[PDB]
Amino acid sequence: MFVSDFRKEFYEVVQSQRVLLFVASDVDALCACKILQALFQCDHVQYTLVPVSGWQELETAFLEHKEQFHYFILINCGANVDLLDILQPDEDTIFFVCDTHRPVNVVNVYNDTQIKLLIKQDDDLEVPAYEDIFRDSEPVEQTMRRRQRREWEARRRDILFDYEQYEYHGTSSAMVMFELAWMLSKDLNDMLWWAIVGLTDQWVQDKITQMKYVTDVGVLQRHVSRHNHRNEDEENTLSVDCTRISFEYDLRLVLYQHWSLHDSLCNTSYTAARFKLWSVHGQKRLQEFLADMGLPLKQVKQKFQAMDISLKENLREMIEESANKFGMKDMRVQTFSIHFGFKHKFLASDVVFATMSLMESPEKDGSGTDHFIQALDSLSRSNLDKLYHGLELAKKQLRATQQTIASCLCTNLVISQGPFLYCSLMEGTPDVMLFSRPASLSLLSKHLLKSFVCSTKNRRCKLLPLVMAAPLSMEHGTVTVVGIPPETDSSDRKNFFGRAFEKAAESTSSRMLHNHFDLSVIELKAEDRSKFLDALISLLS
């Protein structure tokens, strides 16, 4: 069931109890976690944080802890599966699920005793009616009933199929948690920023539509203005500090405030794809764009911070003018920035890329948990050192992304299988270890598809979805496979590959695991890849 009162039904229930907090490995989840942690600190809630990358870790951790805890909180995991069936818990165990994954499992929706969904009830939700999916030598009296039961069960299969076909995401969990803090009158300025970063994570990863993003930006604008007014109230005692969040109609250029304009232009998907920067011709057109701006060469190639103050104040208008001249209409974006002092100013997307690079780091200097915690720590104002380190890792990730895309396109490795495009990375692919985790591979695939649609002349191919594979375990001969929807500005960002992969694996008896919280990312036996993809082609044709 859904929670109608976050205070009485959730927070006041758990704050006096011992709580196990499961947190998925995405920035929105980290941000939601930071907010809840700050609340739990204020109220001295006894809890244990268990970071989880996928279902196996969660299920294992649950077995390890189910005896010492009866109150569980799941952040960005659990909503899209029959949680009671998978975990097989005791009757007294309560699960609070704050997860953006859609669709919500019907059992999670209609269970009243153990599943408590911390999900806004006015989210995009189209749940089936209870009557359609749950029930309570023979004469005609009995056989007619049998016939009706069979027809009901048949409709039920169709109804649940339609309901579970497309995966997508609802409102940011960080935003939901911020609302809780607001209700508790404990919404610190830091929490509002974390809510913003969480929303921005969804946007960066194309998890939500442009319309939903703009709508939610509008909501957060209200809170930013309320906080600004609060920071001017002399009688206010809550979160009295100098930390200022500001709404920004800023440039669609990644990390541009932390390296050169040239680097940002070359490593932003929007411009890299549209200028076709994998080609010399493309690189030439970019130089013509920079020439049309009339900006000096030194000012473009040097770090942004060392730019003439007069040029910084005109850059938004200058770049947008040249952009309009080249027919680019979306150089400007609605977002937020946070200011600490001096040059310590960060756009929301900067923090997303930094936090993501820390969390998804493939380094051996620490385990996945260490990196997760480092990412979680980087969100605290207390020290910006981790954030700045994250920004350096982000630059590397972005450069490697551009190089990988160039290799894929110039080596002609993005090939239509009919109903979908296919491409893959191999063990010998440079920087493959930067793209071997679900999150990193999925984001790479979306960036690659964006560049591909700009590159291709084939009108049919422009509208195709993409399937992308990378090496998982060489020892066990497994690969990770991701599926993403067709790339369009107006996309509803809904994804059918989860159930498509499932049916393809079943009809071929392929050895496959749905370990990621998104069903559109699977682990597959390399030996089965051939028949698996063959079945998938037939299925989607």
Author numbering: 1 to 136, 162 to 566
Provide the authors' original text about this structure.
Extensive experimental evidence has since demonstrated that cell division cycle protein 45 (Cdc45) is required throughout the process of DNA replication: it is essential for establishment of an initiation complex at DNA origins, and for chromosome unwinding and DNA synthesis at replication forks. More recently, Cdc45 was shown to be an integral component of the Cdc45-MCM-GINS (CMG) assembly responsible for DNA unwinding in the replisome. Recruitment of Cdc45 to the MCM2-7 heterohexamer is a key step in the highly regulated process that leads to the activation of helicase activity. Evidence concerning structure and function of Cdc45 remained elusive, until recent reports identified it as a remote orthologue of bacterial RecJ333435, a 5′-to-3′ single-stranded (ss) DNA exonuclease with multiple roles in DNA repair and a member of the DHH phosphoesterase superfamily.
The X-ray crystal structure of human Cdc45 was solved at 2.1 Å using the anomalous signal of crystals derivatized with the mercury compound thimerosal. A construct with an 11-residue excision (lacking amino acids S154 to I164) crystallized readily and was used for high-resolution structure determination. Crystallographic analysis reveals that human Cdc45 adopts a compact, disk-like shape, resulting from folding of the polypeptide chain into a closed arc, from its N- to the C-terminus. The only deviation from a globular fold is represented by a large helical insertion in the DHH domain, spanning amino acids L118 to S197, which projects away from the folded core of Cdc45 (discussed in detail later); the insertion consists of the low complexity, acidic region, which is almost entirely disordered, followed by the seven-turn helix α6 pointing away from the Cdc45 fold. Our crystallographic analysis shows that Cdc45 bears a remarkable three-dimensional similarity to the RecJ exonuclease, which reveals their homology despite very little sequence identity. Superposition with RecJ confirms the identification of Cdc45 residues that occupy equivalent positions to active-site residues in motifs I–IV of RecJ; the structure shows that three out of the four active-site motifs of Cdc45 contain inactivating mutations, providing a structural basis for its known lack of nuclease activity. The structure shows that the DHHA1 loop reaches down across the groove that separates it from the DHH domain and inserts F542 in a hydrophobic pocket on the DHH domain surface, lined by residues A24, G54, W55 and C77 and with V52, L58 as its base. As a result of these interactions, the DHHA1 domain latches onto the DHH domain, causing the steric occlusion of the inter-domain groove, which represents the ssDNA-binding site in RecJ. At its core lies a three-stranded antiparallel β-sheet (β6-8) sandwiched between a long helix (α9) and a helical bundle (α10-14).
